[PDB]
């Protein structure tokens, strides 16, 4: 009942409810809530836009979600170590994120039009660069076992083949729309 739960509380009182909605991606939902609040307020978070922290947090959340999805898909297919690798990467990402809010998976740092400018360290950026190098290495290691494995290919080749009209009928979006050949993405619109 998150709908009525938010509807019966003030605007800030329902803030963490968005994190519980998308458990894997708690930053994208918070950013969406902040943008919607700003649109209702008719303004924009100047400090958040100028600091690029919103973009960095969205990219980190997207990376974490992709790692978690890869781990779950590998576990379901039968790969038991990619889950551990993606979980280590997600642990590093959550450690980086918690330096801004103090929580591993429910940060709720993004406010409607205010930004906690004090919680900004350059050491965080340096560690983010180091984590980016480590994540590149981890992605290479993961692709070394899932991209070319014949078992994985035969377990995914031509599986669930959808199309443009099929996606349009049910409104499939995101990675599904991208795989269906649809070039629709709110980021680049």
């Amino acid at each position: 009942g998150s709908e009525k739960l938010i509807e019966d509380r003030p605007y800030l009182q329902g803030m963490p409810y968005f994190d519980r909605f998308d458990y894997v991606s708690m930053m994208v939902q918070e950013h969406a809530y902040c943008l919607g609040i700003e649109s209702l307020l008719g303004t924009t978070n100047y400090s958040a836009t100028f600091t690029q922290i919103r973009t960095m947090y969205d990219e980190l959340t997207r990376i974490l979600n992709h790692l978690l999805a890869v781990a779950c898909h590998a576990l379901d297919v039968g790969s038991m170590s990619s889950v551990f690798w993606a979980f280590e990467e997600r642990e590093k990402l959550m450690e980086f994120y918690e330096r801004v809010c103090g929580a591993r998976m429910h940060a709720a740092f993004y406010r409607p039009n205010e930004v906690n400018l004090n919680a900004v360290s350059s050491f965080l950026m340096e560690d983010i660069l180091e984590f980016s190098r480590n994540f590149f290495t981890t992605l290479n290691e993961m692709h070394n076992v899932l991209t070319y494995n014949k078992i994985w290919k035969q377990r995914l080749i031509n599986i669930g083949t959808y199309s443009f009209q099929t996606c349009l009928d049910y409104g499939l979006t995101g990675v599904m729309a991208r795989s269906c050949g649809l070039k629709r993405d709110l980021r680049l619109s």
Partner: protein
């Protein structure tokens, strides 16, 4: 649509499979090396050092005798309650106490 650009997984390195990704990796390595060299140039690093006097009951605007009496009333002997220093730091706006990390950062072994 009439001239697609296709990214094809061909090498064992997904980063090598994309020229932009290899450039990003090289840029990250160069930036890390430059930051490391810039830090190594100084050889010492400032760091935030808390002080027990920061958790003092009264601010600098208070009188010197009153500050010492307040510090003694709470049974405080760890924070600096010197009257001379309190008078000398009257209405001060220093940043904070800071420590200096001295390179190289190595484990202090007890070997004999």
């Amino acid at each position: 649509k009439y001239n697609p650009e296709l990214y094809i997984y061909k090498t064992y390195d997904m980063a090598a499979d994309d020229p932009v990704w290899r450039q990003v990796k090289l840029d990250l390595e160069w930036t890390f090396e430059n930051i490391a060299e810039r830090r190594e140039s100084l050889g010492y690093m400032p760091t935030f050092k808390g002080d027990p006097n920061f958790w003092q009951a009264l601010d600098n605007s208070f009188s010197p005798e009153n500050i010492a009496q307040v510090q003694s009333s709470i049974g405080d002997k760890v924070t600096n309650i010197d009257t001379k220093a309190l008078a000398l730091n009257h209405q001060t706006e220093e940043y904070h106490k800071t420590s200096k990390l001295v390179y190289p950062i190595r484990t202090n072994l007890v070997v004999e």
